[PDB]
Paper text:
Thus far, eight human P2YRs have been characterized and are classified into two sub-families based on their sequence homology and signal transduction mechanisms, including P2Y1R-like receptors that signal preferentially through Gq/11 proteins and P2Y12R-like receptors that activate Gi/o proteins. P2Y1R and P2Y12R, which recognize the same endogenous ligands ADP and ATP, play vital roles in platelet aggregation, making them attractive drug targets for the treatment of thrombotic diseases. P2Y1R activation initiates shape change and activation of the platelets, while P2Y12R activation further amplifies this process and results in platelet aggregation. Thus, we solved the fully active structures of P2Y1R and P2Y12R bound to the agonist 2MeSADP and different classes of heterotrimeric G proteins, G11 and Gi2, respectively (the antibody scFv16 was used to stabilize the G11 protein).
At P2Y1R, the 5ʹ-diphosphate is anchored in the extracellular region of the receptor by two salt bridges with R1283.29 and R3107.39 and a hydrogen-bond network formed with Y1102.63, Y1112.64, and T205 in the extracellular tip of helix II and ECL2. In the active structure the adenine ring of 2MeSADP rotates by 90° and moves towards the receptor N terminus. This likely results in the outward movement of helix VI on the intracellular side, which is required for G-protein coupling. Furthermore, on the opposite side of the ligand-binding pocket, the ionic interaction between the 5ʹ-diphosphate group of 2MeSADP and R1283.29, which does not exist in the MRS2500-bound structure, pushes helix III away from the central axis of the helical bundle. In the 2MeSADP-P2Y1R-G11 complex, the side chain of N351G.H5.24 in Gα11 forms multiple hydrogen bonds with the main chain of Y3247.53-D3298.48 in P2Y1R.
Author numbering:
A (entry chain A): 3 to 58, 181 to 232, 236 to 353
B (entry chain R): 40 to 340
C (entry chain B): 2 to 340
D (entry chain G): 6 to 63
E (entry chain H): 1 to 120, 134 to 247
């Protein structure tokens, strides 16, 4: 029409860029953002190393390919900011991955153990309006260390709610999981959890099943099936 | 001879009431559903456009109802001309079949998104959904066009014009064979699809992937009731229509006549069941509360 | 001993600074602008709509020619827009998909972006190989890059999550001067037309003035009570406005050390995410979080015009250097250009 | 304790900020008003330019 | 660095077919619109064929329309050129020319070395170059004028006028890529001017390197036609 040769060529270049962007969007439709949150004492680094082995500063991402779908987790533990100005960038995530140490119910500065800080972080991150359509994954590492450590320290001295099998190495874990789930507000959000050890083969399979179930529930909400 | 006289007037007496009730309830339901769909949803998906197409088909259905309601009100008489009866029957049949096909497409989409969520993640697009929708519109239109040709108006022995939705007793055998073939092809295969998809999604839901997964009992019950309401109306309606056209050929004997009258009455009740099912299906689909009822309540407030 | 004495001396010094600021407040702008006619109501229409992004965007910056745009989204793509012909000039892939700021050089030779990656990548648009690739990675920040502004072809000021601002050099690749003194986390930057000095805002409701050459703070503004994430110099350069999270804007004066008027109304509860000035400075534009953009009069403090555009957080309010267009992006991956 | 250095830096910052000459707010307000009045006749946002001079009419 | 070397050249009997390929390296070949310009022994440069990025837009000149085809292989990073039938008018040295188009872009940045092969005009814009040789002295002011059939000023506000200089014995290079702006790698002594039709090129402090042949190009209309060729001789 009235467009010149330079204008026509620029429009053609813009259309090519749009086609490339559409192809990239189609490719990105098969990848899901998984916000990974946890303290520095939760063994995040060895957790990612174990996941990489099982599969085969600034933030870092770990793409894994399983059944032709890509999972990536962003490690935002290195950010020392207030976390209330950049957490909205993860509004469109599918699930939030939490790693809480099983051997941190007595280690403390301000006369407070690390479990209280983890509970406060979980409470202040679930209540965020950004994470209203994303599920929760609660990984619990160093399972073997908890069995040996429970013989020395007791949860009664710190949390006055653990009554029953004081020395069992199997009930305190259920109790801490239960109280962590209790932080869920009136908005019913599914909190997946797993009892993983330092060396295991189901570490990636559990998160695969969890993200599959999260996508299934999102589809059920989308498909008017609840 | 032929059993022209119909002793069972209870069908023609009770039928206008059920159609007018269906008319009013489906009119309000379709109006509110379309108003939601056209203003209060900016983002749309494949299941969303499938539900919108189903709602539009049901709206065309409910606007088709008043003509049949007035036709069946006093007696078997059509005040308007042959063209009005032709168009009304054509739109009635095409809307019914489009609603059935939209239910089948919704079920297929749900099966793909539930049984293989990650495998089908990114496989379904807006363009693909639109292409499938327009393809099903065109295929239903070209499948009901022979019904459009076969329809007509014929003079009855009661001196009242009969709005024959199927045949004027002229091409009865050819119409019967064509209708049987079309009903088989575009109902049984969709029936196989609907049954298999609901069975597989029910199996997937009962086979929970993880212990932490939420309870699926409500969704399973909703799927079962949707399948039941779909099955108890459309299958009886189709099979009894097939029986009616079969009886119009090798039955209607002066020796025995009560069987034909009872078959006609059961055909009428199955037609009423199909109409009420096609009316309640958009309402039942909408009234689930996963993402629609809450936003509709927000829209009103 | 000594810490308590120093703290109380600092408190007394702040009190006497506030007393001196109040003493020189002879008259506000309300009693002296009653002799001029107000502008009234104005209407702006979306002349251009730029829809080519996949994820939510957070940054934009106009050029000197007022025709080229740059926008950063969460899809890991930086693309150059055309404000006139509605075309994508470039499409720069990003090694990190988490960026919160973008900067366009006044000469147009370079473009910068930053965010959660803690690296302010510099991309050379005028590349002899055609494809736009990274030129220098401005690494060495412990926080997330919140704002980026170009003042020269080799100098750039970048804010980060470490509650400080840094001046970088692309050629050397190392920061030159570090602006320390911000107790809160800096979120926005603004460069004065004279380019000699710039002001920044942080989470402590304090606007600290900085000098590029001096490298140390000279002026401090404390007029807000909530987090401040938007700032913009006046065209005259003797004033600036800040957009905080409590739905208020104050026209702080460099030579008066005090705010002039409060730009707020009782019908708004959400926060402000971006503020910008017009070419003349009479018209003030603020980007709110109510899925809407509002316009305030700098001399009368009135809502002179409402921009009903996108339906999500704007975060991308900007004005051309020549005051011809007002581009307004949002999280819906859309860029609306107003006039 | 490293808080002593922070405290002394802060008190020095306030001390140097105190020794800053401040003009009357009325004069600065008048100057800003005069600048806005002078630039009012040239601002396209304040005064709607015709479509001929507006490059966004198309 | 950007390198464009041609191959597949040599003498061939008229009426045959020859395959010409230029290898591209040092730049994004998939994002550049490749051209084809030949240097006739008794004439100047003239456009032959052009292909866009990704083989999107493929246009040909009226002279070689249908007879000449152009194909590019992005994975192979090599531009190909196939000719159906050759004639005496096609005996020249083709140039593998790259070009990228956007706002502020400079078309025709790098020109290929070229290869030599031997055998044994409607609704277009023509550049009127009255002068052919301009004898000047080094360090003086040199002005070169050019004109077109119709005004090159479009509704956008800028004219599409291109200037080229071909050194004796090597490929030319771009000097001016718009009305009054300078290209990349060109010293700031050049300064274009005009009023829409009377295109002029002002040269100040001319050195011995400017002995090449100048060329005038228009781009408002797609068919690219070079100028007569102003050969500056000291
Ligand atoms: C022998 S009992 C009986 N009674 C009627 N009133 C009928 N009206 C129509 N039919 C038959 O029903 C078919 C289509 O008419 P219907 O839509 O079923 O009923 P109407 O709307 O009243 O025409 C025709 O091919 C006839 O075979 C009827 N059959």
């Amino acid at each position: 029409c009235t467009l010149s040769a330079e204008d026509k060529a620029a429009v053609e270049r813009s259309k090519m860029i749009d086609r490339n962007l559409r192809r990239d969007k189609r490719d990105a439709r098969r990848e899901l953002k998984l916000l990974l949150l946890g303290t520095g004492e939760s063994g995040k680094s060895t957790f990612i190393k174990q996941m990489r082995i099982i599969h085969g500063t600034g933030i870092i991402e770990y793409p894994f390919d399983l059944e032709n779908i890509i999972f990536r987790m962003v490690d935002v533990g290195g950010q020392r900011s207030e976390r209330r100005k950049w957490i909205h960038c993860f509004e469109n995530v599918t699930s939030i991955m939490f790693l809480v140490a099983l051997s941190e119910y007595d280690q403390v500065s301000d006369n407070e153990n690390r479990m209280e800080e983890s509970k406060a972080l979980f409470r202040t991150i679930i209540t965020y309006p950004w994470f209203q359509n994303s599920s929760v994954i609660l990984f619990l590492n160093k399972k073997d260390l908890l069995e040996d450590k429970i013989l020395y320290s007791h949860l009664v001295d710190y949390f006055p709610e653990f009554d029953g099998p004081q020395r069992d190495a199997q009930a305190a874990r259920e109790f801490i999981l239960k109280m962590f789930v209790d932080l869920n507000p009136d908005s019913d959000k599914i909190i997946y959890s797993h009892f993983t050890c330092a060396t295991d083969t189901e570490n990636i399979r559990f998160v695969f099943a969890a993200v599959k179930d999260t996508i299934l529930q999102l589809n059920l909400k989308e498909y008017n099936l609840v | 001879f032929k059993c022209a006289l119909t002793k069972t007037g209870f069908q023609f007496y009770y039928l206008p009431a059920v159609y007018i009730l269906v008319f009013i309830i489906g009119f309000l339901g379709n109006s509110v559903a379309i108003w939601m769909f056209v203003f209060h949803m900016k983002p749309w998906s494949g299941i969303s456009v499938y539900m919108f197409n189903l709602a539009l088909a049901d709206f065309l259905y409910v606007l088709t109802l008043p003509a049949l309601i007035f036709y069946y009100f006093n007696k078997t008489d059509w005040i308007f001309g042959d063209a009005m009866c032709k168009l009304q029957r054509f739109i009635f049949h095409v809307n019914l079949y489009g609603s059935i096909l939209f239910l089948t497409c919704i079920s297929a989409h749900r099966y793909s998104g539930v049984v293989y969520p990650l495998k089908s993640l990114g496989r379904l697009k807006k363009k693909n959904a639109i292409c499938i929708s327009v393809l099903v519109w065109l295929i239903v239109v070209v499948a009901i066009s022979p019904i459009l040709f076969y329809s007509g108006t014929g003079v009855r022995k009661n001196k009242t014009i009969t709005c024959y939705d199927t045949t004027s007793d002229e091409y009865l055998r050819s119409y019967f064979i064509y209708s049987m073939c079309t009903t088989v092809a575009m109902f049984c295969v969709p029936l196989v699809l609907i049954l298999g998809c609901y069975g597989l999604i029910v199996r997937a839901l009962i086979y929970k992937d993880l212990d932490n997964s939420p309870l699926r009992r409500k969704s399973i019950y909703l799927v079962i009731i949707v399948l039941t309401v779909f099955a108890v109306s459309y299958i009886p309606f189709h099979v009894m229509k097939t029986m009616n056209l079969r009886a119009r050929l090798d039955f209607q004997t002066p020796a025995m006549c009560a069987f034909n009258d009872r078959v006609y009455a059961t055909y009428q009740v199955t037609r009423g069941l199909a109409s009420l099912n096609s009316c309640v299906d958009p309402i039942l689909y909408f009234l689930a509360g996963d993402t629609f009822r809450r936003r509709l309540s927000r829209a009103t407030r | 001993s000594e810490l308590d004495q120093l703290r109380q001396e600092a408190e007394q010094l702040k009190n006497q600074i506030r007393d001196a600021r109040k003493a020189c407040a002879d008259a506000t702008l309300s009693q002296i602008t009653n002799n001029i006619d107000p502008v009234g109501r104005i209407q702006m229409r979306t002349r251009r709509t730029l829809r080519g992004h996949l994820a939510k965007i957070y940054a934009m910056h106009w050029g000197t020619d007022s025709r080229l745009l740059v926008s950063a989204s969460q899809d890991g793509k930086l693309i150059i827009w055309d404000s006139y012909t509605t075309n994508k000039v470039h499409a720069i892939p990003l090694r990190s998909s988490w960026v919160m700021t973008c900067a366009y050089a006044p000469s147009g030779n370079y473009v910068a972006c930053g965010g959660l990656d803690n690296i302010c990548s510099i991309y050379n648009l005028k590349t002899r190989e055609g494809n736009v690739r990274v030129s220098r990675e401005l690494a060495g920040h412990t926080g997330y890059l919140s704002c980026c502004r170009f003042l020269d072809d080799n100098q750039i000021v970048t804010s980060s999550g470490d509650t400080t601002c840094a001046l970088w050099d692309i050629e050397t690749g190392q920061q030159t001067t570090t602006f320390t003194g911000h107790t809160g986390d800096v979120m926005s930057l603004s460069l004065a037309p004279d380019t000699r000095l710039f002001v920044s805002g942080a989470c402590d409701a304090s606007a600290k003035l900085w000098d590029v050459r001096e490298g140390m703070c000279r002026q401090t503004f404390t007029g807000h009570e909530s987090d401040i994430n938007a700032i913009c110099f006046f065209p005259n350069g003797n004033a600036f406005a800040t957009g905080s999270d409590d739905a208020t804007c104050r026209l702080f004066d460099l030579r008066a050390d005090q705010e002039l008027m409060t730009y707020s109304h009782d019908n708004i509860i959400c926060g402000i995410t971006s503020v910008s000035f017009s070419k003349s400075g009479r018209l003030l534009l603020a980007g709110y979080d109510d899925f809407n953009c509002n316009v305030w009069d700098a001399l009368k403090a009135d809502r002179a015009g409402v921009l009903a555009g996108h339906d999500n957080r704007v975060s991308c309010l900007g004005v051309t250097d020549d005051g011809m267009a007002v581009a307004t992006g949002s999280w819906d991956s859309f860029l609306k250009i107003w006039n | 304790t490293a808080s002593i250095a922070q405290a002394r830096k802060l008190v020095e910052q306030l001390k140097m900020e105190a020794n800053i000459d401040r003009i009357k707010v009325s004069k600065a307000a008048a100057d800003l008003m005069a600048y806005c009045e002078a630039h009012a006749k040239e601002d396209p946002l304040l005064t709607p330019v015709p479509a001929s001079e507006n490059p966004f009419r198309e | 660095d950007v390198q464009l070397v041609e191959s597949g050249g040599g003498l061939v009997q008229p009426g045959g077919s020859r395959k010409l390929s230029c290898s591209a390296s040092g730049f994004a070949f998939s994002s550049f619109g490749m051209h084809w310009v030949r240097q006739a022994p008794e004439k100047g440069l003239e456009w032959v064929a052009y292909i866009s990025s990704g083989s999107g837009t493929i246009y040909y000149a009226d002279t070689v329309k249908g007879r000449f085809t152009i194909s590019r292989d992005d994975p192979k990073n090599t531009l190909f050129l196939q000719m159906t039938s050759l004639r005496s008018e096609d005996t020249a040295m083709y140039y593998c020319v790259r070009s990228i188009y956007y706002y502020g872009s400079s078309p025709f940045d790098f020109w290929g070395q070229g290869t030599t092969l031997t055998v044994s005009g409607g609704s277009d814009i023509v550049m009127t170059q009255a002068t052919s040789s301009v004898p000047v002295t080094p360090g003086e002011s040199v002005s070169i004028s050019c004109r077109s059939s119709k005004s090159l000023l479009h509704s956008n506000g800028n004219t599409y006028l291109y200037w080229f200089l071909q050194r004796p014995g090597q490929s030319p290079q771009l000097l001016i890529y718009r009305m009054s702006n300078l290209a990349s790698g060109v010293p700031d002594r050049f300064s274009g001017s005009g009023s829409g039709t009377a295109f002029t090129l002002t040269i100040s402090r001319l050195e011995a390197e400017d002995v090449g042949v100048y060329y005038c190009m228009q781009h408002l209309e797609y068919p690219l036609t070079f100028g007569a060729g102003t050969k500056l001789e000291l």
